[PDB]
Design a protein around this motif. Structure first.
Motif, PDB file in Angstrom:
ATOM      1  N   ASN A  80      39.566  18.808  35.854  1.00  0.00           N
ATOM      2  CA  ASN A  80      38.333  18.567  35.115  1.00  0.00           C
ATOM      3  C   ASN A  80      37.514  17.445  35.738  1.00  0.00           C
ATOM      4  N   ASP A  86      46.185  17.713  36.115  1.00  0.00           N
ATOM      5  CA  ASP A  86      45.296  17.208  35.076  1.00  0.00           C
ATOM      6  C   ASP A  86      43.955  16.741  35.620  1.00  0.00           C
ATOM      7  N   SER A  87      43.821  16.604  36.934  1.00  0.00           N
ATOM      8  CA  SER A  87      42.611  16.076  37.540  1.00  0.00           C
ATOM      9  C   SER A  87      41.574  17.145  37.848  1.00  0.00           C
ATOM     10  N   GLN A 138      50.539  23.587  36.080  1.00  0.00           N
ATOM     11  CA  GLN A 138      49.818  22.848  35.048  1.00  0.00           C
ATOM     12  C   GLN A 138      50.596  22.817  33.741  1.00  0.00           C
ATOM     13  N   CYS A 177      47.032  18.531  29.088  1.00  0.00           N
ATOM     14  CA  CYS A 177      47.267  18.377  30.518  1.00  0.00           C
ATOM     15  C   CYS A 177      47.809  16.994  30.846  1.00  0.00           C
ATOM     16  N   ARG A 191      57.740  14.528  44.356  1.00  0.00           N
ATOM     17  CA  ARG A 191      57.448  13.259  43.697  1.00  0.00           C
ATOM     18  C   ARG A 191      58.096  13.179  42.319  1.00  0.00           C
ATOM     19  N   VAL A 245      47.876  17.786  41.632  1.00  0.00           N
ATOM     20  CA  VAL A 245      47.643  16.909  40.486  1.00  0.00           C
ATOM     21  C   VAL A 245      46.880  17.729  39.450  1.00  0.00           C
ATOM     22  N   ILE A 297      40.555   9.917  42.834  1.00  0.00           N
ATOM     23  CA  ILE A 297      40.638  11.372  42.910  1.00  0.00           C
ATOM     24  C   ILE A 297      39.263  11.990  43.165  1.00  0.00           C
ATOM     25  N   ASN A 345      51.464  16.968  29.966  1.00  0.00           N
ATOM     26  CA  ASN A 345      52.232  17.536  31.067  1.00  0.00           C
ATOM     27  C   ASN A 345      52.235  16.623  32.286  1.00  0.00           C
ATOM     28  N   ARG A 360      48.825   6.933  36.953  1.00  0.00           N
ATOM     29  CA  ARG A 360      47.478   7.347  36.591  1.00  0.00           C
ATOM     30  C   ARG A 360      47.343   7.701  35.117  1.00  0.00           C
ATOM     31  N   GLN A 412      42.528  18.876  27.901  1.00  0.00           N
ATOM     32  CA  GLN A 412      42.728  17.785  28.849  1.00  0.00           C
ATOM     33  C   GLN A 412      43.835  16.846  28.386  1.00  0.00           C
ATOM     34  N   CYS A 472      54.106  17.393  44.900  1.00  0.00           N
ATOM     35  CA  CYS A 472      54.218  16.870  43.544  1.00  0.00           C
ATOM     36  C   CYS A 472      55.592  17.152  42.949  1.00  0.00           C
TER      37      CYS A 472
END
Lengths: 253, 318, 210
Positions: free
Chosen positions: C192, C189-190, C13, A111, C37, C187, C163, A114, A131, A108, C34
């Motif tokens: 998890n 990383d979101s 990712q 991640c 963006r 997105v 999210i 990145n 975020r 995580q 994304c």
């Protein structure tokens, strides 16, 4: 063969342990020991998969951590099947679950490395970082929770050696190091980074693994102190040094 | 109260008052279609639900109109041309039905249903052509239906038939007629920029224009991503560098047409670079975008890219 | 309805632009917002290697025709909209025809109002779990791609759209599973925290209820 594989997984030679545990699955009588040996085989395979981290390659880091996680909680799936009413595998299950949680937190955090360059900052004229500030806040909370859980595993063991207790302390110090590396150079470099000069005198490390862990800790702490306020809190060097500290921590088996 | 007590009384009373069966209505109504009159008022009221806002009314109207005349495109073959010739009298296929189905397609969202409607218009007078071009420009005013229907990577015979039918009806109108509600010419150029059917009417609509306010606001992007070279020439022959700076960051442009717009901005910079360089406010992003479009496909602009890079203060550190 | 391929999700990712350029055009079309963006806006990373990666990522998005609408969606001033959503929230204490009949800020406003309506219905009820909370513009199939893209833009610009809250809200949409999958693909990383939020509500299968 079992004792040699046990020594191999003790000293971190995990491919050798994986081969020896594959050679042993047909030798047991009880299915409980079969599940135990299969879980040991999967743990050794996952720690062998973690050795593919060459250097600085966060994509290959994500691939290796994902493969290791897949094998490693396939191993915990086969390990809790070996839990018995008489002599349950309580310490093994907690240690493997904590290793799963640490590896998932590492994935995580990579991640989020990145997600610095991806997912650019919001339309805002700490703050104005997007975020990612809340993401490192959650990562710090998760790593501190991991440190507390390693501490309560330490407190709940009471029957281990000095060596196993030192190993649990080393894992707790690893996740504490990652939490402090988040805090001291992402969240609040001004409030953090006090005179945390560890008095490294007689490094009485009993094992080679302990020597590698404290060498990694010293290197990462020196990098954090050298990169304390040299950059803005939304930094490419901050993510790079932390995200390579992940690699340095996981390089030692 | 006037709401809660009223609802309680309505629930308590349960008085329905004067409150399979589809086959009986369909075979006692199919007869008056071919034999009688004023039953078409029921069909008109049935088609009025196609103009309703809610989706479900249009869905039930389509489902009910599918079987009373008797694989959605195959349903179009079974329902448009097989049940065409003479079920009603000639009155019921005229503008009474045509205007109702014209008002149906403004809010209609199903693309092949719109295809079937425009095919029906192409099958079958001056005011009829006027209303046909009105509803044509009104449905061309929304671009999502042409985006979904007409894909250059998905060649379908239905879309080719649709565009050929529209070229046919516009051929009929331009033969009828030879400030004038000039949006229709914008509509017809933006559907002839699709390209030819995978027929001969395309070249007719091609060569009626280009004699070898009136156009420039938003046109050049869509008539430069067109693959036909006449529209590329018509684009490059009538512009000044402000719209060149406008479309330099536009995307979707293919390699050949980006090479022509690159050479035209090159000769525009060769003409007068001061006004165009003073008009823009971004320098690093401008150099970034011209560099990535330089190394994305054909180069075309090696010298003047260096000229605009050297005009701005260059990067001081590697 | 196609979904995002797994290899595209690891490419997004791992932000590896070399294998991201080998994607198919529909997969790139799904993964546009994304990339737009990170390409249009300020990089917020500011490194030479990421500058080169942004240069290489500007190539494949240049050939796509549909990216211009997304670029126009970035051009809307979101600063005024955050008080507009806040004022609409304080007041609470055909949609497709309006979608293709209004400009980009009004499209943002109507989709944003839809999302906050679904969020308020989620938060007001404890365990209702409406299968179709609001049969609306997300249900048509022709314009759902632009709907999902603009939902991604209205999600990753403000902090007013959490999210996990968006993930819980899209469950009640009749087609919101695909929207949630591509939104998580936008997105990366979101994933998890979306999974953690979705597991944490609802205990059993409820005899395979809605």
């Amino acid at each position: 063969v079992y004792r040699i594989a046990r020594q191999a997984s003790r000293m971190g030679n995990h491919d050798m342990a994986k081969e020896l545990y594959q050679s042993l699955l047909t030798q047991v009588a009880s299915e409980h020991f079969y599940f135990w040996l299969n879980s040991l085989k999967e743990f050794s395979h996952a720690e062998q998969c973690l050795t593919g981290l060459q250097e600085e390659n966060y994509s290959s880091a994500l691939s290796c951590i994902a493969e290791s996680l897949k094998f490693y909680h396939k191993g915990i799936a086969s390990l809790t099947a070996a839990s018995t009413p008489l002599n349950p595998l309580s310490f093994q299950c907690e240690f493997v679950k904590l290793r799963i949680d640490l590896l998932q937190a590492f994935s995580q955090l990579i991640c989020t490395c990145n997600s610095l360059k991806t997912s650019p900052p919001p339309a805002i004229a700490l703050q104005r970082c997007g975020r990612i500030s809340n993401q490192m806040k959650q990562s710090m909370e998760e790593f501190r929770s991991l440190a507390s859980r390693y501490g309560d595993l330490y407190q709940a063991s009471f029957d281990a050696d000095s060596a196993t207790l030192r190993n649990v302390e080393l894992q707790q110090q690893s996740c504490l190091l990652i939490s402090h590396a988040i805090e001291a150079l992402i969240l609040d470099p001004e409030s953090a980074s006090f005179q945390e000069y560890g008095s490294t005198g007689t490094a009485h490390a009993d094992s080679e693994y302990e020597r590698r862990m404290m060498s990694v800790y010293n290197h990462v702490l020196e990098e954090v102190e050298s990169l304390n306020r040299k950059y803005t809190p939304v930094s490419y060097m901050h993510t790079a040094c932390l995200c390579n500290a992940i690699i340095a921590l996981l390089k030692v088996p | 109260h006037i709401l809660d007590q009223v609802k309680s009384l309505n629930q308590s009373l349960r008085l329905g008052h004067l409150l399979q069966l589809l086959g009986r209505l369909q075979d006692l109504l199919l007869g008056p279609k071919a034999d009688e009159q004023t039953t078409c008022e029921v069909l008109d009221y049935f088609l009025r639900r196609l103009g309703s806002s809610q989706v479900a009314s249009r869905v039930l109207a389509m489902k009910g109109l599918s079987l009373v005349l008797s694989t959605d495109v195959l349903q179009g073959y079974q329902w448009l041309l097989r049940d065409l010739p003479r079920l009603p009298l000639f009155d019921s296929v005229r503008s009474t039905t045509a205007l109702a189905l014209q008002q149906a397609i403004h809010m209609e969202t199903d693309p092949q249903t719109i295809s079937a409607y425009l095919i029906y218009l192409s099958q079958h007078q001056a005011q009829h052509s006027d209303l046909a071009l009105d509803v044509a420009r009104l449905v061309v005013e929304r671009s999502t239906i042409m985006s979904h229907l007409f894909s250059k990577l998905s060649p379908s015979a239905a879309s080719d038939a649709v565009l050929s039918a529209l070229l046919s009806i516009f051929s009929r109108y331009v033969r009828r007629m030879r400030t004038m509600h000039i949006l229709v010419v914008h509509a017809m150029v933006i559907l002839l920029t699709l390209g030819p059917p995978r027929d001969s009417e395309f070249q007719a609509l091609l060569d009626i224009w280009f004699p070898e306010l009136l156009l420039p606001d938003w046109l050049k992007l869509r008539m430069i991503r067109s693959e036909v070279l006449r529209l590329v020439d018509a684009a490059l022959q009538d512009l000044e560098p402000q719209q060149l700076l406008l479309f330099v960051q536009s995307f979707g442009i293919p390699v050949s047409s980006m090479s022509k717009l690159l050479q035209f901005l090159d000769q525009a910079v060769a003409h007068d670079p001061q006004t165009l360089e003073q008009n823009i406010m971004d320098k690093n992003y401008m150099a970034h975008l011209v560099e990535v479009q330089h190394e994305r496909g054909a180069s075309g602009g090696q010298t003047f890219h260096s000229l605009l890079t050297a005009s701005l203060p260059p990067r001081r550190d590697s | 309805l196609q979904f995002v391929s797994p290899f595209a999700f690891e490419a997004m990712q791992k932000v590896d632009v070399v294998c991201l350029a080998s994607l198919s055009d529909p997969e790139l079309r799904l993964l546009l917002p994304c990339l737009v963006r990170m390409a249009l806006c300020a990089p917020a990373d500011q490194s030479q290697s990421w500058a080169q990666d942004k240069k290489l990522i500007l190539r494949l998005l240049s050939g796509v025709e549909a990216v211009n609408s997304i670029v126009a969606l970035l051009s809307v001033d979101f600063h005024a909209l955050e008080q507009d959503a806040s004022k609409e929230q304080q007041l609470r204490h055909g949609l497709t025809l309006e979608f293709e009949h209004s400009d980009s800020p009004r499209r943002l406003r109507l989709v944003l109002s839809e999302l906050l309506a679904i969020m308020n219905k989620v938060s007001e009820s404890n365990g209702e779990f409406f299968f179709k909370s609001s049969e609306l513009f997300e249900s048509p199939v022709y314009l759902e791609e632009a709907a999902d893209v603009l939902c991604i833009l209205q999600a990753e610009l403000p902090s007013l759209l959490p999210i996990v809250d968006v993930a819980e809200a899209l469950l009640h949409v009749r087609n919101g599973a695909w929207f949630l999958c591509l939104l998580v693909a936008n997105v990366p990383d979101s994933f998890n925290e979306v999974c953690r939020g979705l597991i944490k509500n609802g205990e059993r299968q409820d005899e395979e209820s809605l």
